[model samples]
Target: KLPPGWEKRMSRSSGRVYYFNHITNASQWERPS
Candidate 1:
């Protein structure tokens, strides 16, 4: 399963998709796996 508190969302500023970790407050262009 996916990591806890991690989410797949869209960036309004860049109009791109990204992965965000709420627990760590980290973001990236690729999946965490």
Candidate 2:
């Protein structure tokens, strides 16, 4: 759900918090090694 089109995802995901801001944008998403 993390994308520029996904506004307010940052606030909704806070309900879990484990997701963090990463759920708001791919830029915040964790990268794989």
Candidate 3:
């Protein structure tokens, strides 16, 4: 499962779900480790 406050959001430009970390304040195409 994903970490707390982390979510999968679809990118408007690429149409792919990306990882978003609220606490980290960052987004990425790859999954968090």
| Candidate 3: residue pairs that collide | none
* Window of ten residues with lowest summed lDDT in model 3: 24-33
* Rank ordering of all candidates by lDDT, starting from the highest: 1, 3, 2
lDDT of 1 by residue, 1-33 (tens): 568989999999999999999999999999887
TM-score, cand. 1: 0.73
lDDT (0 to 1) per candidate: 0.90, 0.36, 0.88
Off by over 4 Å in 3: none
The collision pairs in model 2 are: none
TM-score of 3: 0.73
Candidate 2 lDDT over 1-33, as tens digits, reads 443333332335455322233444443334222
